[PDB]
Structure formats: C-alpha cells, structure tokens
From a paper:
We therefore decided to solve the three-dimensional structure of Vip3Aa after trypsin treatment. Activated Vip3Aa shows the same domain organization described in the protoxin state, and domains II–V maintain a similar global architecture. Domain I, however, suffers a large conformational change that remodels the apex of the pyramid into a ~200 Å-long needle. In particular, three antiparallel N-terminal helices (α2–α4) undergo a set of rotations, in a manner akin to a folding cane, to form a long continuous helix that assembles into a parallel four-helical coiled-coil in the digested Vip3Aa tetramer. The cryo-EM analysis shows that the coiled-coil is relatively ordered starting at the beginning of α2 (~D45), and that the flexible end is formed by the most N-terminal region of the protein, which contain the residues forming the first alpha helix in the protoxin state. Close examination of the structure of the toxin revealed that the coiled-coil of Vip3A, which resembles other four-helix bundles such as the SNARE complex (RMSD of 3.4 Å for 232 residues), extends ~160 Å and that the average internal radius of the modeled section was 1.46 Å. Interestingly, comparative analysis of different structures, like that of the Sendai virus P protein, have shown that hydrophilic residues found in these positions—known as N@d layers—can bind ions and water molecules in the central cavity of the tetrameric coiled-coil. Although the resolution of the cryo-EM reconstruction does not allow visualization of water molecules, there is a clear peak of density coordinated by four symmetry related asparagines (N163) that, based on the buffer composition (5 mM MgCl2), was assigned to a magnesium ion. Domain I is indeed retained after protease digestion and stays tightly bound to the core of the protein through interactions with domain II, forming an essential part of the active toxin. Notably, the coiled-coil observed upon trypsin digestion forms a 160 Å-long dipole that can accommodate small ions in the inner cavity and, therefore, the dimension of this four-helix needle would be sufficient to reach and pierce the lipid bilayer.
In addition, Bt secretes to the medium numerous vegetative insecticidal proteins (Vip) that have been classified into three different families. Vip3 proteins are synthesized in an inactive state, as protoxins, and they require to be activated by proteases present in the midgut tract of the insect. To shed light on some of these questions, we have determined the near-atomic resolution structures of Vip3Aa in the protoxin and activated states by cryo-electron microscopy (cryo-EM).
Residue numbers in the entry:
A (entry chain B): 95 to 148
B (entry chain A): 100 to 148
C-alpha cells in the first residue's frame, strides 16, 4: 500500500508541477508586454503634451 | 508519507485554482491598456481638430 500511495503522490505532484512550469512563463511574458504597453502609453501622452504646447 | 501526500495535494490544488485567475487578470489588464490607447488616439484626433 505504501509503494502505491507513493506512486500516486509522485504522479499527482509531477503533473501539477509541470502545469505550474507551463503557466509561470506565460505570466512573466504577459507582465513584460504590459510594461511595454504602459511605456507606449507614456509616449502617446508625451505626444499629446507636445500637441497642447503647440 | 500520508501527511506529505495530503499537504502537497491540498497546496497544489490551491495553486491550480489560483494561476488561471492571474492569467485572466493579466489578459484583461492588457485589453484595458488597449482601450486606453484607443482613448488617447481619440484625444489626439480631438486636438488635431
């Protein structure tokens, strides 16, 4: 019984951990893209400020 | 070993529940940033007029 319950632990944890491995890089890339988009918005607002100065 | 099993399974199902929420939240944040970009383009058109 001990060996089979340990096998169950093994498979459960390995599956969930590979799911986490798949997930995390997606979040990292999403945050990087969000920061890039915020920088783009900053540039747009600087252009707006130049327009207002003109 | 049973204690290890239950602890790790519980925490791992918690992580499973959590992560998709973060993914959806980031997608919605990016969509909202795109909406802000469109609003600012409309502002620029107003300023050109």
């Amino acid at each position: 019984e001990q060996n089979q319950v340990l096998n169950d632990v093994n498979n459960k944890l390995d599956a969930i951990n590979t799911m986490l491995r798949v997930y995390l890089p997606k979040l990292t890339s999403m945050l990087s893209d969000v920061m890039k988009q915020n920088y783009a918005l900053s540039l747009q607002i600087e252009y707006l400020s130049k327009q207002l100065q003109e």
